[PDB]
Structure formats: structure tokens, C-alpha cells
Nucleic acid binder design. Structure first.
Lengths: 120, 191, 48, 196
RNA sequence: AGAACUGGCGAUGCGGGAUGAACCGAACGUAGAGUUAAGGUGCCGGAAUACACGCUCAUCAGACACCACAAAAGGUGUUAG
RNA sequence: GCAGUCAAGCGUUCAUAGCGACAUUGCUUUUUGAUUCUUCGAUGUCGGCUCUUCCUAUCAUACCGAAGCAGAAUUCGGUAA
RNA sequence: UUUGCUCCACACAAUAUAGAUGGAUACGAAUAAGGCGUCCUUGUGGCGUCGCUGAACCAUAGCAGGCUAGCAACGGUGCACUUGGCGGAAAGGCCUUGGGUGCUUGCUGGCGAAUUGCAAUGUCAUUUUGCGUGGGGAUAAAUCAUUUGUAUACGACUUAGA
């Protein structure tokens, strides 16, 4: 995360070039330090903690950073994954007497659409 | 010692079109259309830039770069296969017996069939470049000028004959003939 | 496994040795009884 | 699953070999046919120079019982697994009596099909340059035959056409019918829960 | 084939070394549980197809002690000096 | 016994076509020599005759490469059992 | 065996066994590339589209709509039996139709106990050995031991003369 050796949770990862889709990219979630998601948007870009193999954190460090990685991104960091992740989390739900909620919940959407897949 | 950037520029000329995508790559234009199945697993030919078509082999070394150029060239002489002209010219030195540079042949035309090398017998007959128009003579000498658009194919016919013409017990040199090769041969154009 | 008896025909080998000459070779001839497609049908199709 | 069909597809011999007789010796009854193309590491001439030993390396030679030198492409994956699990440890004898690597491409199976990840490659595993075979072409060269199979899979693929087309449709329609319910009160509920 | 200390095998099992008097660990009453030596952890087979930075591409290799083998010479193969 | 490096020499002109002193690295286990481990508290010699079967350090046959290879006739070498 | 008999649909007792007692859920190909959608003549274009089976459906509070029942509203769902059609290098697969079984809803009613309804807990499937009511052939066949030799040491092999 600068690159790869860096800092915090809302600050501190630069990057970019080489391979096939790069540019000064920063630190997202983590596994503490066991599987980050090291993206600049970039203006549109993945991430990960592949990674560390040569370059590293473009221009500055700290602050300067903190003064950006959400001074534009984060907000933006809400595409799929972004959204398609959070899901995989409330996967861990009250699923117990929240199942039946889930169940009876879905079991209704069945006929709703299953019906339509027909009358058409 | 493992450069991350190496790239070269393949320079399409007006009236060509490279269809290079998928793995493979085909160039149309002037004379027509040829295609080559480049999997020298690396390159990522690309891109646009108008002129232009750049090659490149990101983060590697050895061949990877080596290949890089071998590629430019390969698809480059390609880009000329329709642009300009094939276009080679074998030349055929006789002995004290003479040769026979005729174009047969069978279910589809084998030939050239040459007869009597260094006073030989036997039916020397060798498949004709399916892509090359193999015109013997002119004005003139004994030279089967036969060229096309597959520079590759052109060559290995040209040659295929000039090997079908042998010499097997005379440690060459003196008894030293064979239907050899001449100019090479971007023809025709020049100016 | 019918029988063996001798021919004698002229050796139009006309390549050499005894071209258009006697030559007395021996034949072994089998009983051929023009056999009749009892049942018939067939077989086929394969990964063998 | 509970009877596993691994499409030879890619996946380098020895590896999809290990994976097998593990999952096998611990008894999860696999059926991995497609074997036709199960790439081994190394150019033909080499792996080929090898097999040209190998059984052919065979011998015995009091009188050809021993090193029964087999050919297939299929019974190659066996030669593998068949070494990698205890081939006369009756346990095995059983655990083996449960593998099913069939010589391309389908048949009675023909439905299911599961790729064995990182025993995969030339794709995932190997670099990135230089040297496969085609589990059977080493055999083509040691002498199958033949392409009757690869042609009978010309067919298989012919058929798969139909299905995959339909399912592109049935699905197309499906979601192009339940995207109404999506956005439907009684659903942004199965959202919040299935997705805050 | 012969000497010299020190261990050892002969008198000894046990775990490593596939395999085996003298190698390594480790000395044995009978049992339960726990850690480990040496050795090992794709698969036979317990143990990660762990995690790192490179090097090697027609037989390149994968041998602490051993019939366990392999030199001088040379390469615009590629790697750093 | 068999290959190998260095190149002073032969090879009339030239070190390596073809060979190579000196010096030096090795492979070989159908010589021979050492050694005494196994077998006298059962192993019968040499040679042939017969009959497979393997090795390649190939004499012949297959295709090729060099030659001080004009043809022929030889030599050297490679793939090859 | 005196045809004594053997092969299909509902039962009845013994057997055993590589180890389900929620689903085995189908594109092909690339990977220095792909997948979907999408408006096109095509290998195009152009958004969009997605890194993860931690899926997807489908669940019987692992006997909910689990037993017995009652509705309005849906014509959707799925189960079993049947025929019209069709596609399978065999099997299985898709379809058409009607009869019939169960369900999405606050719908409504009654049922669940003893410590043998969080342990045994339904059950697993498939082995033919035989013992039962309708359905099909029909007694088919092979041996033994008698014949030159196409065959033979014995076996084995080949075949007729009414």
C-alpha cells in the first residue's frame, strides 16, 4: 500500500503502472495486513495486495494522502464489489429465526414472478 | 534485466487494415488478405493510435523482448505481402548436361518438375506454392521467377525446388550445379 | 480346399528370360459354389 | 457434489492426478472423463521420448507378462492415480474401484462437469510459456486410435449448441420477467435482508 | 593390510536414512495423557499444493556416511560481478 | 584396452583436411594383477557342439557431413543395433 | 420329477454392502483474454455488465403447507397416471392432453405432552433364496457312446448313413 509497505484505514497507499491496468492506486479494506484491496479508482480500477514487486507510492506520503483517498474516492468506491461485497457480509445474518424471514420472504416472490414467467 | 515496458511500432500503410485481434491477426489490402496465428504467448499487440499499431511485451526479458521484434517483423513483412510485391526469383545453373524447368501436373498441379540434373534421369517433381504464381522464363535465361504474397510461402517453394535439385556423390564444389536462387524481391513496385 | 493341378501358358513377361515362351506353372483351384446370401443384414457403427 | 465429474479440459496430468486419488482415496467417487486433452508438462519430443520408454521401457522378458505397457490417453491418468494410491492395499483396490476417467468427452455422463482449479493450467499453474502436450497426443504418437473420439465430440459440441442456446433464452426470459418484481415493495424487503 | 585416541557394533531393541551390524536421534519394567530428536509435510502416507527474493528449460536435475561416482577442457544459453 | 584436452611438430606451401611430442584430465571391467568378503559342515575342470538374448567402443547394409573431395578408389565423422 | 415348468405387475419372509439420512445444477473457447446483454451483414461497433459455489434456485419450525380440517383469492406451483408429437452412436431427454395430489395469503379450527416427541429418528438403497393373486411361451437344449479324417497322446476337433 505504498507499495507494498504503508499505513492506516483511511490513508496511505500510492501506486500505478506496469502490468495491464495500473496508475497511483491506494489502500481500501484489509485483512489487517492479510488481503487489502489496493485501488485508486484508479479513475476506474481494481486493486488487491498482490504485490510489492518494485515501484511504489507515487508522489507523497500521509496527510497529502489522507487529504485525497476519500477527498474523491471512497464515496466513489461504491460500485459492485463495493456493493456486491457488503452483501456477502450480512450473509452472516440472524439466519435462525431470520431464516424463516428469509424463507417465507422469498417463498412469496416465487409465485409473484413464477406466475409472470407464463402469462406473457 | 527484465524490462517492464519494451514495445515496437508496426506501421500500417494507406490501404491495408490489420484484423489483428483474438489471438490471430489478418491483413487485407492491395493484393488481398493473409492471416497469421501468432501465439508467441505474449505481445498484446495494440493499439489504434491511427498510423500505427504498436506491439510490446510488458515486464519480461529474453525471448519475450526477442520475440517482441520477431513479431513486429513477422506481421510487418506480412503488411508488405499485400502492400508491395512477393516476390522472389530462382536462377538455375546448368552443368554439361542441362535441366528441364516445366510446370505439370496431376489432380492439382504439382510441378515444377525438373528433369536430368547433372545429367540425371528420374522424375524430379515438387509441389507448387499454393499461393504463388510460378512463372518460368521471361527475356530471359533459365530462371523460374515464381513469386506471390506469402513471403513465407514464396521462399519455401523457391527453395523447395532448389533442394528437390540434389547432388549426391561428387562432394559438390565442381560437379556443382543446381537450380539456385536470385533476387529478393519486393516486386513489383520500387520507383 | 479343392485341388491342385498344372497349367501351362505362354510367359508374356516380355521383359526377358523366356518372354512369349512355354512355361508350365501349377494351379490350386477351389470349389467356389456361387454361395447365396442366407440371412444377411449387417453390422457397423464404432468407437470400435 | 456426491459423484464428481472433472472435465479433463486442461489441468496438468500429475496434478489433476494427485487431486483425484486424494479426493478418491478419502472416497468421494469422482468421474473425470474428457481425458482426450489432459496436457502434461513438456514439449512432445521430450514427454514423448519418455513414453517411448516407459513400458516400451517395459520388459519382464522371461515372456511378456511384466510391465504391461499401456496406451490410451485415459488409462494414462490411471497409470498415474494407479500409482499414487496403494494399488494392492485392498482399501485402495476399493478406493480405486471408484475413479472414472473416461477417454473424452461424455456418454452416459454428459451433464454436470467441474474444473479442478490449480491443477489447472496451462492456464492457472505453469508459466506463461513453453511446453505442454495433449494427454492423448503423446498417445496419438505412441499410437491410439483415434479422432473418431474427437469427431464424436464434434457431435457432442453440436448438440450442446441447442441447450446452451435455449438456456441463454429461458434465462433471458426469466430475468426479463422477474425484473418487474425487482423494485416491488414485497422484495426490497428480500433486499434489506439479502442485502441491506 | 597396519597403528593411535575417542564413540560404537559384536551383547540392541526403539524413531529417522525406502532398503542395511557400526550413519544420525535416541537406551527398552507395564500402561494414560502431553512435547518433541533425527527426519518429513503434492500423492502413496501422518504434516501447508504453506508464505518470500532470485536461478535454472530435449534428456537440467530431486543422492548428509555407500559399488553411493565423474574430471581436465570448452558455450555469443542465460545471471550477476 | 579406449576415448580427451595444450599445440611443438609431421603433413614439401599450411599447426587440426588427415594426423599429432611433450605434459595433463579421464572411461572402460571379455586381459592381467592385487585383495580374501561369499562358498571344502558339495561349487565338478578347457573346448567344442547346440540355442536364444542383450551391449555398441558399427565390419556390411540405410541417409547424411569434411576431405590434401574432379571420376572412380579410398579416408574422417554423425543418426543408426 | 409325472412338462414337472421357466421369464412381466401388487405382497412375504432372509440377506448382505465401501459407505447420504436437501440437489450430480449440463454451452465452446480463449487466458498478452473472456462472459453475458444489447441495437447489427460477419471475426464489428457502441454502454452495460460483472475480482470471491461465502453461488444460484429449492427447504419438510432436517413431520411449517409437519396429522385432521375449513375459506377468499390466484391460474401460477409442483406429485403420481395416462394418450398426440419429437429428439437420442442404447439409456435418458424434451414436449401435448385430460383426469386427478398437494400450495402465496394476516386466512380459521383443532392436533403435539410421560421423560421412549436434540436419540434413535422416518428411513438407506439393491442381493437374489425361496413363499403368494393376474400375465407370456412352450417342453428348448446340451450331453453320454457308435463313424473316414480335414481333428487328435488323453481332453480337446471337426460330421452323418435312410
Amino acid at each position: 500500500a505504498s507499495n507494498w509497505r504503508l499505513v492506516e484505514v483511511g490513508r496511505v497507499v500510492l501506486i500505478k503502472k506496469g502490468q495491464s491496468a495500473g496508475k497511483l492506486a491506494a489502500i481500501v479494506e484489509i485483512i489487517d495486513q492479510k488481503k487489502v484491496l489496493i485501488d485508486g479508482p484508479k479513475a476506474g480500477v481494481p486493486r488487491q495486495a498482490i504485490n510489492l514487486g518494485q515501484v511504489v507510492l507515487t508522489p507523497l506520503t500521509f496527510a497529502l494522502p489522507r487529504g485525497a483517498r476519500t477527498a474523491t474516492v471512497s464515496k466513489k468506491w461504491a460500485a459492485a464489489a463495493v456493493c456486491e461485497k457488503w452483501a456477502a457480509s450480512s450473509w452472516a445474518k440472524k439466519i435462525a429465526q431470520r431464516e424463516r424471514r428469509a424463507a417465507l420472504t422469498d417463498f412469496e416472490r416465487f409465485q409473484v414472478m413464477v406466475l409472470r414467467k407464463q402469462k406473457r | 534485466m527484465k524490462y517492464i515496458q519494451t514495445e515496437q511500432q508496426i506501421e500500417v500503410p494507406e490501404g491495408v487494415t490489420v484484423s489483428i485481434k483474438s489471438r490471430i491477426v489478418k491483413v487485407v489490402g492491395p493484393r488481398g488478405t493473409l492471416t497469421k496465428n501468432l501465439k508467441h504467448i505474449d505481445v498484446t499487440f495494440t493499439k489504434v493510435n491511427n498510423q500505427l499499431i504498436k506491439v510490446a511485451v510488458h515486464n519480461g526479458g529474453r525471448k519475450h523482448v526477442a520475440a517482441l521484434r520477431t513479431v513486429k517483423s513477422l506481421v510487418d513483412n506480412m503488411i508488405t505481402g499485400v502492400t508491395k510485391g512477393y516476390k522472389y526469383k530462382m536462377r538455375y545453373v546448368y552443368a554439361h548436361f542441362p535441366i528441364n524447368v516445366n510446370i505439370v501436373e496431376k489432380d492439382g498441379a504439382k510441378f515444377i518438375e525438373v528433369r536430368n540434373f547433372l545429367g540425371d534421369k528420374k522424375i524430379r517433381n515438387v509441389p507448387v506454392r499454393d499461393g504463388v504464381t510460378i512463372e518460368f522464363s521471361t527475356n530471359v535465361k533459365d530462371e523460374i521467377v515464381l513469386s506471390g504474397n506469402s513471403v513465407e510461402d514464396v521462399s519455401q517453394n523457391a527453395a523447395d525446388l532448389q533442394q528437390i535439385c540434389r547432388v549426391r556423390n561428387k562432394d559438390i564444389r565442381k560437379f556443382l550445379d543446381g537450380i539456385y536462387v536470385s533476387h529478393k524481391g519486393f516486386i513489383t513496385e520500387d520507383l | 480346399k479343392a485341388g491342385m493341378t498344372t497349367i501351362v501358358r505362354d510367359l508374356d513377361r516380355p521383359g526377358s528370360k523366356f518372354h512369349k515362351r512355354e512355361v508350365v506353372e501349377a494351379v490350386t483351384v477351389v470349389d467356389t459354389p456361387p454361395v447365396v446370401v442366407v440371412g444377411v443384414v449387417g453390422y457397423v457403427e464404432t468407437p470400435r | 457434489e456426491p459423484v464428481v465429474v472433472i472435465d479433463g479440459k486442461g489441468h496438468l496430468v500429475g496434478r489433476l492426478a494427485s487431486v483425484v486419488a486424494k479426493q478418491l482415496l478419502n472416497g468421494q467417487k469422482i468421474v473425470v472423463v474428457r481425458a482426450e486433452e489432459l496436457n502434461i508438462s513438456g514439449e512432445f519430443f521430450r514427454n514423448k521420448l519418455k513414453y517411448h520408454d516407459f513400458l516400451r521401457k517395459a520388459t519382464a522378458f522371461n515372456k511378456t507378462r511384466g510391465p504391461f505397457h499401456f496406451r490410451a490417453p485415459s488409462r494414462i491418468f490411471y497409470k498415474a492415480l494407479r500409482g499414487m494410491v496403494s494399488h494392492k492395499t485392498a482399501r485402495g483396490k476399493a478406493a480405486l474401484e471408484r475413479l472414472k476417467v473416461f477417454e473424452g468427452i461424455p456418454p452416459p455422463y454428459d451433464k454436470k462437469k467441474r474444473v479442478v482449479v490449480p491443477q489447472a493450467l496451462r492456464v492457472l499453474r505453469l508459466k506463461p510459456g513453453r511446453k505442454y502436450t495433449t494427454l492423448g497426443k503423446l498417445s496419438t504418437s505412441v499410437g491410439w486410435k483415434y479422432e473418431d473420439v474427437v469427431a464424436k465430440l464434434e457431435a457432442k459440441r453440436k448438440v450442446s449448441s441447442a441447450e446452451y442456446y435455449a438456456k441463454k433464452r429461458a434465462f433471458t426470459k426469466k430475468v426479463a420477467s422477474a425484473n418487474a418484481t425487482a423494485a416491488e415493495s414485497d422484495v426490497a424487503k428480500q433486499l434489506a435482508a439479502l442485502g441491506y
